[PDB]
Amino acid sequence: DKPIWEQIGSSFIQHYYQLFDNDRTQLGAIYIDASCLTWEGQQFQGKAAIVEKLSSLPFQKIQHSITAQDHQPTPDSCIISMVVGQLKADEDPIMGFHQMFLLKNINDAWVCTNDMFRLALHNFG
Amino acid sequence: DKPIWEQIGSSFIQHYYQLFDNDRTQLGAIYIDASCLTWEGQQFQGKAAIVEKLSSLPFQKIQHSITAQDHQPTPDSCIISMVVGQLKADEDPIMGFHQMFLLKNINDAWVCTNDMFRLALHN
């Protein structure tokens, strides 16, 4: 009785972070040539540029934890998902993050066409 | 200047928060009948339900400030806008929030088809 979009969105999220936290050089499998990534405000178009950027991050170990995830179907048969959570890389402070994914079913598989990620900064005084 | 999707997206965000902060019962103006909202994990389907929920919020006045806004175009001619910010309702403590919008041009006008909102935790 759980909607298809929640089932698919939840499984996609789990798989994405599993790949991210263990071997991000293998993340291309979930993107396509026409994909777009926005990381910390910077945009990257196309699978090649996206995998290059993600693989390039100066972290040795990364772990994501999901606080909440919401999924909805969109008018063009896609699935849109919003994730709020925390992340811990190396010995950097744990920080919150927000991420959005748009999934489309192509060739009988759900892949990501749009990925937007932003890490929270702490507001100092 | 800014890419077309950032121009449209940033203008939509301004319209949405201006309506929320100044006359939220008129928020229907930026939705369509089939829009969907998930608010603090609860889903409100259709413009009627969405506008009733937002109108019903237990505060008289609210002000939002956007601390970061990111926008992307999609292959199917839509725009995704991702926002982080702070808000203050009446005399309550300032609270952080995250919101995401999916926009589509329907009947020659950009409108929101999907909206997700979450208040910042802070355990």
Determine the Cα–Cα distance for residues B24 and B89; give it in Å rounded to an integer.
13
Nearest to B102 among A68, A80, A96 (CB): A80
Residues of A in contact with B43 (CB under 8 A): 72
Which three-class secondary structure state does DSSP give residue A53?
helix
Quick check: A82 and B36 CB within 8 A?
no
Q: For every residue of chain B, which 3-state class applies, written as one string?
A: CCCHHHHHHHHHHHHHHHHHHHHHHHHHHHEEEEEEEEECCEEEECHHHHHHHHHHCCCCCEEEEEEEEEEEECCCCEEEEEEEEEEEECCCCCEEEEEEEEEEECCCCEEEEEEEEEECCCC
- Give B43's contacts (C-beta < 8 A, 6+ positions apart): A72, B36, B37
State the structure-solving technique: X-ray
Beta bridge partners of A62: A89
Residues of B in contact with A42 (CB under 8 A): none
Query: Residue A16 carries which DSSP code?
Result: H
Give every CB contact of residue A43 below 8 A, 6+ residues apart in sequence: A36, A37, B72
Residue B6 CA to residue B41 CA, distance in Å, equals 27
Residue type, A121: L
DSSP designation for A75: T
CB-based contact B102:B80 (threshold 8 Å): yes
Neighbours of A38 (CB within 10 A): 20
Judge contact between B31 and B47, C-beta under 8 A: yes
Q: Does the beta-carbon distance from A84 to B118 stay under 8 Å?
A: yes
Cβ contacts (< 8 Å) between A102 and chain B: which residues? 74, 80, 102
Q: 3-class DSSP state for residue A56?
A: helix
Task: Give the integer Cα–Cα distance in Å for A26 and A30.
Answer: 9
CA distance to A18, A55, A87, B73, B90, per residue, from A59 (Å):
16, 9, 12, 29, 42
CB–CB contact B72 A38 (8 Å): yes
Q: Is the dihedral of CA B45, A109, A105, A67 positive or negative?
A: positive
Residue of B nearest to A78 (CA): B76
Distance CA B80, CA A17 (A): 21
- In a 13 Å sphere around the CA of B39, the CA atoms on its Cβ side amount to 14
Asked if A46 and B19 touch (Cβ cutoff 8 Å), the reply is: no
Residue A113 is nearest to which of B43, B75, B118, comparing CB atoms?
A: B75
- Asked if B78 lies within 8 A of A76 by C-beta distance, the reply is yes
Q: Do A100 and B80 touch (CB under 8 A)?
A: yes
Q: Spell out the domains of chain B, with CATH numbers in brackets.
A: 1-123 (3.10.450.50)
Residues belonging to chain B: 123
* H or E segment to which residue A93 belongs: none
Model resolution, angstroms: 1.6
Helix (H, G, I), strand (E, B) or coil at A91: coil
The whole-angstrom separation of Cα A99 and Cα A16 is 12
Q: Sort strands A31-39 and B62-73 into parallel, antiparallel or unpaired.
A: unpaired
Cβ–Cβ < 8 Å for A70, B116: yes
Q: Residue B32: how many CB atoms within 10 A of its CB?
A: 16
Please name the residue of chain B whose CA is at the shortest distance from the CA of residue A115: B72
Helix (H) or strand (E) holding A83: strand A79-89
Q: How many CB pairs under 8 A join A and B?
A: 73
